[PDB]
A and B are shown apart, each in its own frame.
With several copies, the nearest count.
Chain A
Amino acid sequence: TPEEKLLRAIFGEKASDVKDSSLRVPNGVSGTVIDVQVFTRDGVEKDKRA
């Protein structure tokens, strides 16, 4: 809309081709992480955590 791009012009920030889809802890849950199990498809390179 005109207002949001007006703010964009005023302050100069630009949101790039990125959208937040990160996992979040469900509300009311407080605890400790025990295991992180990551599977990756064959063909694509694996991260250093993997």
Chain B
Amino acid sequence: RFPALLAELNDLLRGELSRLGVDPAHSLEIVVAICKHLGGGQVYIPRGQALDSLIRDLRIWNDFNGRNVSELTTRYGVTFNTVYKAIRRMRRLK
């Protein structure tokens, strides 16, 4: 499982470096670096699901300024309970 996934990861890293102006071969260093600092065991790579919901609520209350909460339920289709919890959360943070 490791070889093909590592190869694709290196391909994407070098593509992103080329897009950003960095030399693609520098990606090897990057992956080597992460291969030193990310080991320890077996765990699947996902995303920031907590951060995904965090930025979702961020966008929700950035678009929210009143009645457009209904538009929020029309934006993607979500509950008013989570929207109200997110509003209270944005009130909590300063």
A contacts B: CB pair < 8 Å: yes
Interface residues in B36-72 (C-beta closer than 8 Å to A): 36, 39
Residues of A within 8 A of B (CB): 11-12
> How many positions in chain B have a CB within 8 Å of any CB in the partner chain?
2
3 A-B pairs in the complex with CB atoms less than 8 angstroms apart? A11-B36, A12-B36, A12-B39
Which residues of the partner chain B approach A11 to less than 8 Å between Cβ atoms? 36
Which residue of chain A is the closest to B47 with respect to CB atoms? Answer: A12
Which residue of chain B is the closest to A10 with respect to CB atoms? Answer: B37
A11 to B33, CA, bound (A): 12
Minimum C-beta distance from A22 to chain B (A) = 28
Which residues of the partner chain A approach B39 to less than 8 Å between Cβ atoms? 12
